[PDB]
Design a protein around this nucleic acid. Sequence first.
RNA 1: GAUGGGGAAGCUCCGUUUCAAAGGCCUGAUUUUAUGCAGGCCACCAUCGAAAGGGAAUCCGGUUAAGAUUCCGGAACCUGG
RNA 2: GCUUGUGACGGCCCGUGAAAAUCCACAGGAAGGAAUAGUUUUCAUGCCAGGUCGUACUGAUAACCGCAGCAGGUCUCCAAG
RNA 3: UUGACAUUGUGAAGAGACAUAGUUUCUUUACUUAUUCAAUGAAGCGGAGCUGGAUCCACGUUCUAGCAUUCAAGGUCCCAUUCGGGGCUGAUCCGGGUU
Lengths: 87, 13, 213, 52, 224
Amino acid sequence: MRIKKKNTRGNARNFITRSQAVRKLQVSLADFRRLCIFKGIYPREPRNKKKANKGSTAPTTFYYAKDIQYLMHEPVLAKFREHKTFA
Amino acid sequence: KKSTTSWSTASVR
Amino acid sequence: GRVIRNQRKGAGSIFTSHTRLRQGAAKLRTLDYAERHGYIRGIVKQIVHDSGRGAPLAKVVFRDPYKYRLREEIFIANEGVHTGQFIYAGKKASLNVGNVLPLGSVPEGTIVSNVEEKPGDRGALARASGNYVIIIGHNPDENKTRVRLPSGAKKVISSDARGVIGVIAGGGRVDKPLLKAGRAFHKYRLKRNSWPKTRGVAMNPVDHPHGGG
Amino acid sequence: YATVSKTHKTVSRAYGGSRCANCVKERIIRAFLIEEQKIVKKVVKEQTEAAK
Amino acid sequence: NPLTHSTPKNFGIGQAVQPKRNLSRYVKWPEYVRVQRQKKILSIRLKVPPTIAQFQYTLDRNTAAETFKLFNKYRPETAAEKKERLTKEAAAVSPKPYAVKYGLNHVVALIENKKAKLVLIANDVDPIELVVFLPALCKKMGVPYAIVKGKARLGTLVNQKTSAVAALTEVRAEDEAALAKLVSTIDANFADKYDEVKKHWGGGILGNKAQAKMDKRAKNSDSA
RNA sequence: GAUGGGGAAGCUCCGUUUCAAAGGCCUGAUUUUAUGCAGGCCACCAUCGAAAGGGAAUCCGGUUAAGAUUCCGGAACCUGG
RNA sequence: GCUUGUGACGGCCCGUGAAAAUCCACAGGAAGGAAUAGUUUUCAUGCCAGGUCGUACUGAUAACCGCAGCAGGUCUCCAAG
RNA sequence: UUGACAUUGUGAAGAGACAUAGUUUCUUUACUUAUUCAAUGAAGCGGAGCUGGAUCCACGUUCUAGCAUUCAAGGUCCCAUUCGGGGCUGAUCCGGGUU
Ligand SMILES: [Mg+2]
Ligand SMILES: [Mg+2]
Ligand SMILES: [Mg+2]
Ligand SMILES: [Mg+2]
Ligand SMILES: [Mg+2]
Ligand SMILES: [Mg+2]
Ligand SMILES: [Mg+2]
Ligand SMILES: [Mg+2]
Ligand SMILES: [Mg+2]
Ligand SMILES: [Mg+2]
């Protein structure tokens, strides 16, 4: 097995920032916030913030990556897209 | 239990 | 008949240049706004030998005007340029050895090298060791400059074309006898496969038209 | 170098590691003297502009 | 405030790094953008024959607004209310309809048979040969026409995306006077006003730099 | 040696970053017009090509008919989390 | 003394004698962080894991090529008195 | 290598024919818009400044192997002061041509 890269596993994969979550969901920020409220997705705090954010100490909101992945399968998102088309 | 299409949900939280 | 080497050389193959150990193509800076309107200062970091080229090369570091970083340029070193020297390139540069100036900004009798044939090609004339170009005269109405080339020819070129003040370093190289087929071998090993040469008369008539007898 | 502590790869000085002590001393001297000369040149040119 | 100081930046040559500036003039655009822009520029630069150049003279803003205000009262029946009408005829077993006539072949036939009271021709028709003969045909048949800006506007008139032509043939008795007044207005503002200027070649326009060079050369010639 | 392109009747040829809309990242309650994503940043090109070039880190003892820095016993080291 | 590795030097060139992956350091300071409690996983110790393929033997006057168990040909390491 | 035709456009000046109202042929001289060559990070091109100094210049860079990067500090209008947030300027304007 070859040498593994850093900032790929552990805290780097467990958490996802809000901008990355919005980009992955391909929605707007307002839709993201409303979906998080509806589904009960809440921000979390890693015990190693520099490991989670590649050495930055800047304040960042983190979510569970698996929570975002589960959020990807919500039909209310499809309803939001249908409303955009109707508008 | 197993997937049929390449994109699935299968409803486990 | 058969194909002679004169015709075989055009296919490339074993007649391409030996360019592994080269330092890089020797060119002036791209003619940008700074050199068009004012000047820019670089620093000579080192003077190095280029394999296959008689003249030495100079590494000159400038600052990127649009981004925080350094840009390295490979110049052909003029005689008298030393490491640590400040080099000024542009229209407002002073008349000192090593500086890069437009041809229209120098007086008659000025000696230059690495002269652009057209403004922007980044140096084409008087690049070999010991060679230089003399500024014969100016024609401001046509915005042209008459120069004398190393071969003795006289050329008319744009006054926006650039040149480096001075003469190419490494002169007097061809005044020393090689004395040895080995020295010729090592000379051409770093350039190209054009050595040794067999006389056409020494060949058969099929190989060369001069052959036979 | 990734297996040793930072103490083995640096010395306790500005540019410690990358630059040696004499080079650091010379660049400190050059920076100070050139900034002072820049102040002098600015004053001289500003006075000369009015005097001309 | 003793803690803050003024630190001006020198943005001259050989000085501090240049700041961000608007470089929209130097953008390397996508090839389709470059093609459509250069096509428009070339159409401006070349000498345009009169039968194409006549399509640059259209109705003015007020007259066009009045024309479309008249035509939107005769916008054709949609598919939704056609089903309503067809069910009303089934129970009975309908008055005469009034609508804007559209479709290029249909309108050309109406013009040739002298049934069209008014004809509207879109100016942005590609290929232009589809309507380049229409003003001459209308003039020879004695039918009032008007060149208008927007095949999309005519499309909104006829419930389509685009329409090359629209025509008014039959009008109600409440709007016959308005139609006659509109015809007289278009005759005064479009037919009579642009009668001479439509006979000239268009697009004799130099570029910005060439124009400046020509003006500088003329100034240098006239005055030393 | 593909792609973007350009040649060739065509099998295919050129070329290897150009001639391409060639993709990643940050911030947001964007003064809200009320269930429609806004403001910015940075930039150059696939892939293949060395069991003698570059390259993370292991040793000793014992053991078999035939294995061995790989097994057994003991003692280490590297990489990632 | 022999072999080998290494150091500081000296001679030679119209010959001045690879690239990249990869690792570290510096400059900078977006920021974050303590009083009855913080910080530091570049100090030590403690926890977990490390897939696939090759691995026998000959390497030659008999295990390779030369129609052969052919006086031919075929790269290299160690080396006692 | 030489010549013809097509690609092939727009002006002005001087000569020809309708017998001294502009429809075309022949020379001269311009222009750009087709076509062609080159470069770039398609960054500073062209014109103008009741811009300043003295027709020309940016008077924003020349003893020195230093440094120059976080929407730029400052000035000035607002905000609802609160960790700070916006606007003009700093860095002139216009263009339908990347050079
Ligand atoms: Mg012979
Ligand atoms: Mg190929
Ligand atoms: Mg490979
Ligand atoms: Mg190896
Ligand atoms: Mg064995
Ligand atoms: Mg073991
Ligand atoms: Mg073995
Ligand atoms: Mg063996
Ligand atoms: Mg055999
Ligand atoms: Mg055989």
